[PDB]
Amino acid sequence: ECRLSVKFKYDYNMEFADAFHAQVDKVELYVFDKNGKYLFKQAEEGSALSTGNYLMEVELPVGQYQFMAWAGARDSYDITSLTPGVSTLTDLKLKLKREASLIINKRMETLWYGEVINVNFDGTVHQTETINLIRDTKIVRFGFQSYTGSWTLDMNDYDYEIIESNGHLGHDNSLLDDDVLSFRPYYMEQKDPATAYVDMNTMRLMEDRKTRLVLTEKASGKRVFDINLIDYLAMTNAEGKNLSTQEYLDRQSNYHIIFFLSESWLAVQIVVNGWVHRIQEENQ
């Protein structure tokens, strides 16, 4: 007669505060048993989640379970379909959809990973479990300007890519083996050459990856800029906070980076969300 409820939170962000009700409009809870065998999933989405008091009511027999979730997953992603009593956690995988070209140029609906929890429900009390959500999709606005302003960098001369094989996530949120994808702008603006920017997005930024930002000249097809974005972000100060690289990468999901370049396409300095950082030539 007692009921088991699930609370979802999204406080693992740079505001260190829960933004679930404000940002997450779909949760899908996966339930596995004592043995790690899949039992079912349960999806809810829409206005219910926005109240500030959303709880998911989960009908479950007395017993021990593991829960995890994916939140926000809609048309951009294929999540494997599991068979009750047959499949286990390691069967659950999420893959960003791509065509043969391996180019992604759409803005994906924001994706959150719900960490795995052990749940022991004996039916004697009303109980609420909490799912903790980690943002996996990362939005970046890039600007490119002359450091001395002695030449005008024109942003429509080039193509822009973020290159990584981060499009296949396991049940533990780890990057599975996958093809390397080319993430390219979903929006570009050069109204004021000083205003000018491209908006891009990618999947998880990992401290142990070497995710690349690559610019290619339309005219020649020559690559003019090729940097390790993870490394450029690691060199920074996590926006003044006391964070490990991975924690900053997980917590922050909007990155507005201006590159101030030499005439020879060397980054002299970058500005990441307002923070100025000199790039040491040896680490360019």
Residue numbers in the entry: 34 to 317
Quoted from the paper:
The selenomethionine derivative of BT1062 (residues 23–317) with an N-terminal His tag was expressed in E. coli and purified by metal-affinity chromatography. BT1062 is composed of 21 β-strands (β1–β21), three α-helices (α1–α3) and five 310-helices. BT1062 is likely to exist as a monomer in solution, which is consistent with crystal-packing analysis and analytical size-exclusion chromatography. The most significant additional structural feature of BT1062 is a small β-sheet at the domain boundary formed by the EF loop of domain I and the BC loop of domain II. Most sequence homologs of BT1062 and Mfa2 contain two highly conserved cysteines at the N-terminus (Cys25 and Cys35) located near the tip of the bilobal molecule. The conformation of the peptide between the two conserved cysteines is likely to be flexible since residues 24–33 are exposed to solvent and disordered in the crystal with no interpretable electron density. The most conserved surface residues of BT1062 homologs correspond to a short sequence motif 306N(G/D)W308 located in the β20–β21 loop.
The BT1062 gene of B. thetaiotaomicron encodes a predicted lipoprotein with a molecular weight of 36 535 Da (residues 1–317) and a calculated isoelectric point of 4.8. BT1062 is a member of a functionally uncharacterized protein family [Pfam PF08842 or DUF1812 (domain of unknown function family 1812)] consisting of ∼80 Bacteroidetes proteins of around 300–400 residues. Therefore, the BT1062–BT1068 genes are most likely to encode a fimbriae (or pili) system similar to that of the minor fimbriae of P. gingivalis, with BT1062 being equivalent to mfa2. Thus, DUF1812 is a collection of diverse proteins that are likely to be fimbrial components.
